[PDB]
Amino acid sequence: KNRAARVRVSKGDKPVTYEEAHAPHYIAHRKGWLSLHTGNLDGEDHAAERTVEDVFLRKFMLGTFPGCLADQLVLKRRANQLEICALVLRQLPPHKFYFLVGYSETLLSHFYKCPVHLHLQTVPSKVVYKYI
């Protein structure tokens, strides 16, 4: 059987996001891409760099916002600037949320040598597509 990026059927109680509810053969058909950048187009360069950046960004954002991260990150790259769009549970007081917004934006702007935008969309609890 194909195990790739699949959430196996449970006893029927298992809450599932729209994201996790669709296997790899459904990309570009039903679910879209979690990253947007030019580097994978036909005549273009530095796909490798954008990829390693991507990975580090997911890992980093997951570690910087413990427990409040709802869905997988959305990374949009436009003309040297990267906008990170995130779905975030309401856990921390807005004080901590802003603290980490600024801290992260600054830190990654100085790390990757480009302007970093961070857009937080807050949601009460994980949005459920299926089962449950």
Partner: protein
């Protein structure tokens, strides 16, 4: 080596090995047990062992109406903080290793006799808190399946009663023990018997029944003699509200047959009133302690007979060689006279 790391969920799923092939066919023992503990449980945002204090996270943003600068704790302060977190871990390990007490029904490892607590409220909002449920028998049962081979379903037999004379049993079956418990409760509420109780402690009259291969023999006791019976029957009796009885079971002791036969035999009871009405006579009780005094229990509503009952010099009744052997003192069994704990 940073990219070489993973999510905590992935790591626990990996280390626990629940989804393996050893778990399914029971290829490994149940005495081997390991658990998952959250490592984010006691941690706060901003806290590290370097000891920093961040204006938005660790400490309040404004002290004395001004903005607090980024600062670092003293060495000994961090020592006390780490001591506190360590004592927190040891506290949760102290909480985890303590096993809650399970009230034992009959035996330590048996589920029989155990109370499941009041059944679940019906769809109409109907609620029974007056009902208690006891487990009669839990049994692991198997079926051979084309793919899976042996397939294990638990089936439990459970009885409910309010203590007021209404009781009933039912059976339930599931892959999980919990599920079967629920099913059996909720199903049991639907089948209820009314069991008439003479003076609300004993039964009305001596019963003997052969149900299938089981023989139940129940004798009606006076007030002080508590529940001398097979343990299952004692349970069902405490649920019915029968406080004084003697019952011997012979032949196959198989549980289900025992309770079906039991409830049938108790359902077949004939009240003094029914007797009074079918014979059209006064049924009159003679206490031994009250002497010759003729207490009238039941009177035949409608027209009483002027005709006396035909007197049979010698009665024709089926007699159990056991009762006769008892009456004449030929039962010498070392097991019969034994002193036991309270009902």
């Amino acid at each position: 080596s940073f990219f070489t790391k993973l999510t905590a969920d992935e790591l626990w799923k990996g280390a626990l090995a629940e989804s393996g092939a050893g778990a399914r066919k029971g290829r490994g023992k149940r005495t081997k047990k390991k658990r998952r503990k959250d490592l984010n449980r006691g941690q706060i945002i901003g806290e590290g062992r370097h000891g920093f204090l961040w204006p938005g996270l660790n400490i309040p943003l404004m002290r004395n109406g001004a903005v607090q600068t980024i600062a670092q704790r003293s060495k000994e302060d961090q020592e006390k903080v780490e001591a506190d977190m360590v004592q927190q871990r040891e506290e949760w390990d102290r909480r985890r290793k303590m096993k809650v007490k399970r009230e034992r029904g009959w035996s330590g490892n048996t589920w029989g006799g155990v109370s499941l607590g009041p059944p679940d409220p019906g769809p109409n909002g109907e609620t029974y808190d007056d009902f208690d449920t006891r487990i009669l028998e839990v049994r692991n049962v198997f079926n051979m399946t084309a793919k899976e081979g042996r397939k294990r379903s638990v089936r439990v037999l459970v009885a409910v009663g309010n203590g007021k004379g209404a009781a009933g049993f039912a059976i339930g079956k599931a892959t999980e023990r919990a599920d079967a418990f629920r099913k059996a409760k909720n199903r049991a509420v639907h089948y209820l018997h009314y069991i008439e109780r003479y003076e609300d402690h004993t039964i009305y009259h001596d019963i003997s029944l052969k149900f299938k291969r089981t023989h139940i023999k129940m004798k009606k006791q006076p007030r002080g003699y508590g529940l001398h019976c097979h343990r299952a029957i004692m349970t069902i009796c405490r649920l019915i509200g029968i406080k004084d009885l003697y019952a011997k079971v012979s032949g196959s002791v198989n549980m289900l047959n025992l309770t079906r036969g039991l409830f049938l035999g108790l359902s077949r009871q004939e009240t003094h009133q029914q007797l009074a009405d079918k014979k059209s006579l006064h049924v009159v009780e003679f206490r031994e302690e009250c002497g010759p005094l003729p207490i009238v229990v039941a009177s035949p509503q409608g027209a009483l007979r002027k005709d006396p009952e035909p007197e049979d010099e010698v009665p024709d009744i089926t007699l159990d060689w056991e009762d006769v052997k008892a009456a004449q003192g030929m039962k010498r069994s070392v097991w019969s006279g034994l002193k036991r704990a309270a009902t």
